Amino acid sequence: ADKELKFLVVDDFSTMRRIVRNLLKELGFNNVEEAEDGVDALNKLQAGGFGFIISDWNMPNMDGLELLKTIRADSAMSALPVLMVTAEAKKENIIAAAQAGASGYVVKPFTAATLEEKLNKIFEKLGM
């Protein structure tokens, strides 16, 4: 993947957004923006240029799964990589993420190494 790939980090908890952003920076990905929920995220996505989405599962107004579906059903954004982040891995949620088209699924908190590992699995799958 290109070091300048533009990421959108979505979470209603500001501290977690900062942490994910810092983890991305640690891996050399500096082009990162933030959104506080699914609605805010879609609003900023309408601006264009985004190449990767990392979204939390539980957020008000529009949660992670709802954001993911919206992206996948949109003609311009349908192929965007989306890594889902959750507080707890659950069978039902995992199957739901698969059905909706999640590129990845990871439990927080996670280290830089783990993030790197999840991103690389997605890049490889997508030939990025």
Partner: peptide, 13 residues
Amino acid sequence: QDQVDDLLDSLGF
């Protein structure tokens, strides 16, 4: 946990 982990592994997550 073992099962959750195997599910994730099977799905490529």
